[PDB]
Amino acid sequence: GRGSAAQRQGALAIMSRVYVGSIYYELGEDTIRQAFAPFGPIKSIDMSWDSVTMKHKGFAFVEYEVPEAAQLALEQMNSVMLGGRNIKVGRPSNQAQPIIDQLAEEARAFNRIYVASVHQDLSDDDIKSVFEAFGKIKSATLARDPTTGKHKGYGFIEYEKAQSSQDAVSSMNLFDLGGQYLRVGKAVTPPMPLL
Amino acid sequence: RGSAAQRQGALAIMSRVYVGSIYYELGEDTIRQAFAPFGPIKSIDMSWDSVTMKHKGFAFVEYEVPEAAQLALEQMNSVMLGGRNIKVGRPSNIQAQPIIDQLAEEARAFNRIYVASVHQDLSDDDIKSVFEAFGKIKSATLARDPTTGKHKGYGFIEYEKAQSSQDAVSSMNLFDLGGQYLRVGKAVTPPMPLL
Ligand SMILES: [Cl-]
């Protein structure tokens, strides 16, 4: 095999964060959150800060709950204009690369796609019906709050065939469902990566 | 929307991408090699600080067509060059935005895709045959040097149906053909934009 459970977890953590730069001085955490939340609920944000000037240094690190959200944010939020500036989005610059590469390779063995911006009223069966228009589905599951049981606005769908997942991503990314636009992309990690 | 002069000014802006966070040791040659897969580089405007006799860490790469800049923006952002994750964005200058928006809207009326990194040995009919696997094609044309008649490694393909063009982009971007990987994407301008 490759990567101790501990190594894999460290990689997953790094893969869940995106660097955001060129942030207008007047913009704060709440603006960033609003702009990046469509890709998955924000776990936390580490904003730069200067004690002498009493302001952030123009950049921040947004952390998501899963790697897939960071991947979509990276592909869709770069150069978007915020506060009059084109923000920059990238992967953290900080030995984890080989593990990250291994996870990406392992993910290709599944026809799994990540779906974000899922309206609160949609259920697992609702998402499944819609997405099975692209092909037979092995499983469709929305992530849920461990306490409430309410889904967190995102989930994963596994198809029996690769062509089905490819078609789904191409047709459903930015699809307007329930008033919001879904953010869809191929998985970048296998399911249960630390197993 | 916009006269011929306004549209051409927009097309010019749309053909350039900002490249930032360039390692001090890297020069024009490295940038060109890294960005050429999306279309042949027309020119590069590199920042310059003579006092220290070094560039300022950023440059503007100009392509022959807007589609190449679009692909470069979607595929080169955060790529690691010289140990640094480069940043790619649209020029911050631009009153041209409304015209750019108009061109994007007009482009959606055609099922046109841009194909870059086309090996020199491929011909128009070669490209057509390959791509017609996705659907009936109205035209497949590689851009050619006005003097030699040799294609410049890129072209445009128009499909009769939108689903065909969508399938082609999804299936052919990064497709290994003739030793290189094709760079494919939807057109961002209508054909003959200033007509
Ligand atoms: Cl080949």
Author numbering:
A (entry chain B): 114 to 207, 210 to 310
B (entry chain A): 115 to 208, 210 to 310
Question: How is this structure described in the published paper?
Answer:
Homologous to both U2AF65 and the yeast Mud2p, the Poly(U)-binding splicing factor 60 kDa (PUF60) shares domain features with U2AF65 by also containing two central RRMs and a C-terminal UHM. The most noticeable differences of domain structure between PUF60 and U2AF65 include the lack of the RS domain in PUF60 and a highly extended linker connecting the second RRM and UHM in PUF60. Although both U2AF65 and PUF60 are general splicing factors, the PUF60/U2AF65 ratio in cells influences alternative splicing patterns, suggesting PUF60 is implicated in alternative splicing. PUF60 appears to promote splicing at a weak 3’ splice site.
Herein is reported a 1.95 Å crystal structure of the two RRMs of PUF60 (PUF60 RRMs) in complex with a sequence from the adenovirus major late promoter (AdML) pre-mRNA 3’ splice site region (AdML3’). The structure reveals a homo-dimeric organization, where each participating PUF60 monomer captures a nucleic acid tract, and the PUF60 dimer places two nucleic acid tracts in antiparallel directionalities. Second, each monomer only binds to a short tract of nucleic acid using only the RRM1 but not the RRM2. Furthermore, the first position uracil bound to subunit A accepts a hydrogen bond from Lys-201 of subunit B, as discussed in the next section. RRM1 residues surrounding the uridine are shown in Fig 5, where Tyr-132 is the most outstanding feature that provides stacking for the uracil base. Therefore, UG is found bound to one subunit and UU bound to the other. Therefore, the bases of the wild-type sequence bound to the protein were assigned as U17-G18 on one side of the dimer, and UU from the polypyrimidine tract (PPT) on the other. Therefore, the looping in the wt dAdML3’ is deduced to occur between U17-G18 and the PPT. The Lys-201 side-chain from subunit B contacts U17 of dAdML3’, which is bound on the other side of the dimeric interface. This lysine donates a hydrogen bond to the 4-carbonyl oxygen of U17. The structure of dimeric PUF60 RRMs in complex with the AdML pre-mRNA 3’ ss region sequence suggests that PUF60 may also structure the pre-mRNA, albeit using a “looping” mechanism instead of “bending” as used by U2AF65.
